[PDB]
Design an enzyme around this catalytic site. Structure first.
Site, PDB file in Angstrom:
ATOM      1  N   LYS A 113      43.204 -36.836  20.470  1.00 50.81           N
ATOM      2  CA  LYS A 113      42.488 -37.757  19.757  1.00 50.81           C
ATOM      3  C   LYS A 113      42.372 -37.438  18.258  1.00 50.81           C
ATOM      4  O   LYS A 113      42.974 -36.268  17.942  1.00 50.81           O
ATOM      5  CB  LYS A 113      41.227 -37.565  20.466  1.00 50.81           C
ATOM      6  CG  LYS A 113      40.573 -36.098  20.058  1.00 50.81           C
ATOM      7  CD  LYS A 113      39.289 -35.682  20.822  1.00 50.81           C
ATOM      8  CE  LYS A 113      38.824 -34.356  20.446  1.00 50.81           C
ATOM      9  NZ  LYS A 113      37.645 -33.911  21.422  1.00 50.81           N
TER      10      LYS A 113
ATOM     11  N   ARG B 280      25.372 -33.822  25.333  1.00 56.72           N
ATOM     12  CA  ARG B 280      25.839 -34.708  24.182  1.00 56.72           C
ATOM     13  C   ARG B 280      26.078 -35.940  25.158  1.00 56.72           C
ATOM     14  O   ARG B 280      25.474 -36.961  24.917  1.00 56.72           O
ATOM     15  CB  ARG B 280      27.180 -34.131  23.806  1.00 56.72           C
ATOM     16  CG  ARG B 280      27.795 -35.349  22.755  1.00 56.72           C
ATOM     17  CD  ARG B 280      28.821 -34.681  21.861  1.00 56.72           C
ATOM     18  NE  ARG B 280      30.063 -34.042  22.871  1.00 56.72           N
ATOM     19  CZ  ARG B 280      31.075 -33.527  22.210  1.00 56.72           C
ATOM     20  NH1 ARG B 280      31.014 -32.862  21.091  1.00 56.72           N
ATOM     21  NH2 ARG B 280      32.163 -33.271  23.104  1.00 56.72           N
TER      22      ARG B 280
ATOM     23  N   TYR C  16      37.101 -28.894 -13.195  1.00 53.19           N
ATOM     24  CA  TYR C  16      35.532 -29.642 -13.678  1.00 53.19           C
ATOM     25  C   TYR C  16      34.742 -28.657 -13.398  1.00 53.19           C
ATOM     26  O   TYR C  16      34.588 -27.603 -12.719  1.00 53.19           O
ATOM     27  CB  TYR C  16      35.491 -30.582 -12.442  1.00 53.19           C
ATOM     28  CG  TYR C  16      36.271 -31.800 -12.612  1.00 53.19           C
ATOM     29  CD1 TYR C  16      36.514 -32.753 -13.592  1.00 53.19           C
ATOM     30  CD2 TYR C  16      37.167 -32.336 -11.393  1.00 53.19           C
ATOM     31  CE1 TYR C  16      36.938 -33.769 -13.874  1.00 53.19           C
ATOM     32  CE2 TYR C  16      37.767 -33.302 -11.643  1.00 53.19           C
ATOM     33  CZ  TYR C  16      37.875 -34.170 -12.753  1.00 53.19           C
ATOM     34  OH  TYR C  16      38.645 -35.330 -12.780  1.00 53.19           O
TER      35      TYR C  16
ATOM     36  N   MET D 167      40.375 -34.494  -6.791  1.00 53.26           N
ATOM     37  CA  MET D 167      40.947 -35.284  -5.840  1.00 53.26           C
ATOM     38  C   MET D 167      42.435 -35.429  -5.450  1.00 53.26           C
ATOM     39  O   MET D 167      42.762 -35.542  -4.508  1.00 53.26           O
ATOM     40  CB  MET D 167      40.358 -36.749  -6.377  1.00 53.26           C
ATOM     41  CG  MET D 167      40.611 -37.869  -5.342  1.00 53.26           C
ATOM     42  SD  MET D 167      40.255 -39.504  -5.689  1.00 53.26           S
ATOM     43  CE  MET D 167      38.420 -39.274  -5.883  1.00 53.26           C
TER      44      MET D 167
HETATM   45  C1  LIG Z   1      38.186 -32.978  22.259  1.00 52.06           C
HETATM   46  C2  LIG Z   1      37.575 -32.404  23.713  1.00 52.06           C
HETATM   47  C3  LIG Z   1      38.665 -31.528  24.238  1.00 52.06           C
HETATM   48  C4  LIG Z   1      39.832 -30.635  23.615  1.00 52.06           C
HETATM   49  O1  LIG Z   1      39.275 -29.480  22.664  1.00 52.06           O
HETATM   50  P1  LIG Z   1      39.450 -28.517  21.864  1.00 52.06           P
HETATM   51  O2  LIG Z   1      38.584 -27.377  21.535  1.00 52.06           O
HETATM   52  O3  LIG Z   1      40.453 -28.730  20.711  1.00 52.06           O
HETATM   53  O4  LIG Z   1      40.459 -27.450  23.200  1.00 52.06           O
HETATM   54  C5  LIG Z   1      38.585 -31.638  25.607  1.00 52.06           C
HETATM   55  N1  LIG Z   1      37.684 -32.149  26.338  1.00 52.06           N
HETATM   56  C6  LIG Z   1      36.759 -33.049  25.921  1.00 52.06           C
HETATM   57  C7  LIG Z   1      35.568 -33.472  26.823  1.00 52.06           C
HETATM   58  C8  LIG Z   1      36.816 -33.221  24.384  1.00 52.06           C
HETATM   59  O5  LIG Z   1      35.903 -34.044  23.997  1.00 52.06           O
HETATM   60  C1  LIG Z   2      40.542 -39.840 -11.315  1.00 50.16           C
HETATM   61  C2  LIG Z   2      40.549 -39.862 -13.031  1.00 50.16           C
HETATM   62  C3  LIG Z   2      39.729 -40.897 -13.271  1.00 50.16           C
HETATM   63  C4  LIG Z   2      38.447 -41.443 -12.825  1.00 50.16           C
HETATM   64  O1  LIG Z   2      37.232 -40.617 -12.955  1.00 50.16           O
HETATM   65  P1  LIG Z   2      35.937 -40.710 -12.407  1.00 50.16           P
HETATM   66  O2  LIG Z   2      35.081 -39.573 -12.389  1.00 50.16           O
HETATM   67  O3  LIG Z   2      35.947 -41.041 -10.979  1.00 50.16           O
HETATM   68  O4  LIG Z   2      35.356 -41.973 -13.231  1.00 50.16           O
HETATM   69  C5  LIG Z   2      40.042 -41.211 -14.775  1.00 50.16           C
HETATM   70  N1  LIG Z   2      40.945 -40.646 -15.344  1.00 50.16           N
HETATM   71  C6  LIG Z   2      41.917 -39.606 -14.887  1.00 50.16           C
HETATM   72  C7  LIG Z   2      42.783 -38.964 -15.549  1.00 50.16           C
HETATM   73  C8  LIG Z   2      41.655 -39.087 -13.463  1.00 50.16           C
HETATM   74  O5  LIG Z   2      42.626 -38.350 -12.877  1.00 50.16           O
END
Ligand SMILES: *Cc1c(COP(=O)(O)O)cnc(C)c1O
Ligand SMILES: *Cc1c(COP(=O)(O)O)cnc(C)c1O
Lengths: 359, 359
Positions: free
Chosen positions: B34, B129, B255, B303
């Site tokens: 999943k 759950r 930043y 980012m």
């Molecule tokens: C996703 C999930 C798993 C697998 O879990 P892991 O912790 O990665 O081993 C198995 N059974 C159910 C019901 C789950 O939702």
């Molecule tokens: C991503 C980025 C932006 C935009 O910044 P925001 O704070 O999300 O507006 C502008 N200029 C450069 C050089 C960036 O890397």
């Protein structure tokens, strides 16, 4: 059912570009759409803004994807190109690029291109991330004006590291350095992104680069939202309940038994988890809208599900609409509650979310 | 591709299924894939394991994608179906399903299908759950055996909430409840996922559902890795440097001016950020491998970029290989260092990250 989905309001997107033109009336717009347009969709966000003067991306891959989708406007490579063998594509694509290092410049100098390329010399003015440092900038700049392969004039770009902190003199210092270097030089000037646009009108210059606020989200970290600036939220992270179960006092919920109920109640299970991009860090109590009505997250957020406390006779049903953030619930408020940056919340989503576009 | 990339080892993947068959020798395997196979790729991970007895998914959409890609093994809908109108597809696609609520059961009762469907009644044994509570389980169970639409016998499934905490009696209590309900009933039993498989051999029963450990990553937060159980890591989050710059002492990086250098040094900039899925929460000092040598992250993860401290006379250069986690750096180390769950680290990645498959 409808499970996990991001609804993008094209109308709000348009409104924000126009609203930003009102805030920076003497500056052209570089719509920043890097990282799949901040989680809103790279190509669709571009197609929604045919009015943008240009588009900004982080990587060459993103720009080429735009051209592949039929986007025709100028695209700025904010970090420049990573390989000299890319110049021919950049030139043929009419891609504008930043130039921050020796490799890029030496590449410009020796390449043989059918057309010259528009360039923005990235200056380091304080962020100390990318860009030519001041003491190297004049010589570096002069080599660019001597390139056949560089359209003249050479434009100058830079970026703020702390524009969202008006009380420290970081921004005014970067501005001081930026201004000193641009004195007497032709070519366009750019240093302002979302923060500089909203809080520093002295930094608008020729081109401003709206990113986060373009999507109606505040770049600050007070409790401020995009509506504080007349910008409308574009994204709505939605899903549906896949179960409404009885629960009893003293019983825990989720992994680690993180939350224990003090009363008999009914729990709702949302088809949303971090496998979709929802923060695993979200603490119990974080707000989520069920049928329009705020309910709290109870227990640890799992990979595919989230439990919420509805109430003992809550009449919610498998099937009913859930809003993780959206109309009624700004992503900022989720950021404050979870302590996760709104930048990351809207951007770090996975390919399992389905994308809708309205208006 | 030289930037954000996930390299998947097809052969570590195969090794892990077999290694898990050695740890749970009397149980069949439900390979849990999943959430895009935990970041590794839903369809490719399934195609790498044609030996799996079955595949587990969270949602119907994921199971359909598997059939669309040609995957033919039985697929288990771990959360069941969200709409009664889905039963016809599920029957025709030969999908096995969990049944945890009235809606699903009533749907099975009155549907008209060309073929009956294999079902696993979800029993809530403590997680609170999904699943039918103990006091409602016997009546609910009996209605499923009377179903002409359900392939007999009715199988029984459940899930542990704290199997990674051997000292609390949570698991023994769920097991006690699980065992009491299954007494005298035919049909397969299944309650163990990664934790139950490794720490609780009395919970293996007929089918075990390996998820995280299948990818060579430990389920526990005890500092242990997949190698502690003979499982090999499948994913490597890689990228490249896009800049190597001089830096001076007293100067901040990124930043918010989060990190300030105490010495003249050289900084490397990585083509990796949270727009790719790398945690924005990563603190300065978090390990990264540059040219197979560990260097610390300095300043905020952005980012699209990461800065690392290389050293004053360091000779790394733009274009050089970077490993965020993988070969010489387990994702479990990064989880500890960032305090982000390994489950989330490998899974909450964006569509910006390229996918490579080796072996
Ligand atoms: C996703 C999930 C798993 C697998 O879990 P892991 O912790 O990665 O081993 C198995 N059974 C159910 C019901 C789950 O939702
Ligand atoms: C991503 C980025 C932006 C935009 O910044 P925001 O704070 O999300 O507006 C502008 N200029 C450069 C050089 C960036 O890397």
């Amino acid at each position: 059912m409808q499970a996990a989905t991001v609804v993008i309001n094209r109308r709000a997107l348009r409104h924000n570009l126009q609203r930003l033109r009102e805030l920076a009336p003497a500056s052209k717009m570089v719509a920043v759409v890097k990282a799949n347009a901040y989680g809103h969709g790279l190509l669709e966000t571009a197609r929604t803004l045919p009015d943008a003067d240009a588009f900004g991306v982080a990587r060459l891959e993103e720009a080429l994807r735009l051209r592949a989708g039929g986007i025709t406007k100028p695209v700025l490579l904010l970090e420049g190109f990573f390989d000299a063998r890319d110049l021919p594509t950049i030139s043929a694509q009419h891609f504008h690029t930043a130039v921050h290092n020796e490799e890029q410049l030496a590449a410009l100098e020796e390449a043989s291109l059918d057309e010259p390329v528009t360039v923005w010399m990235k200056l380091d003015t304080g962020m100390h991330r990318l860009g030519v440092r001041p003491e190297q900038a004049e010589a570096f700049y002069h080599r660019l004006t001597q390139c056949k392969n560089v359209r003249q004039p050479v434009n100058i770009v830079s970026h703020f590291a702390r524009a969202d902190e008006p009380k420290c003199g970081a921004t005014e210092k970067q501005l001081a350095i930026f201004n000193t270097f641009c004195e007497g030089k032709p070519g366009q000037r750019s240093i302002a992104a979302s923060g500089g646009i909203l809080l520093w009108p002295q930094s608008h210059f020729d081109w401003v680069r709206p990113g986060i606020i373009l999507y109606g989200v505040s770049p600050l970290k007070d409790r401020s939202t995009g509506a504080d600036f007349g910008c409308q939220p574009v994204m709505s992270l939605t899903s549906s309940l896949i179960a409404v179960r009885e629960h009893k006092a003293g019983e825990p919920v989720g992994y680690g038994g993180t939350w224990v109920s003090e009363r008999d109640t009914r729990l709702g299970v949302v088809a949303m988890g971090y496998g979709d991009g929802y923060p695993r860090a979200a603490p119990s109590g974080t707000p989520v809208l069920v049928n329009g009505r705020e309910v709290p997250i109870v227990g640890r957020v799992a990979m595919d599900m989230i439990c919420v406390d509805l109430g003992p006779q809550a009449q919610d049903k498998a099937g009913d609409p859930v809003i993780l953030w959206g109309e009624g619930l700004p992503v900022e408020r989720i950021a404050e509650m979870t302590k996760v940056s709104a930048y990351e919340l809207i951007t770090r989503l996975t390919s399992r979310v389905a994308m809708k576009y309205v208006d």
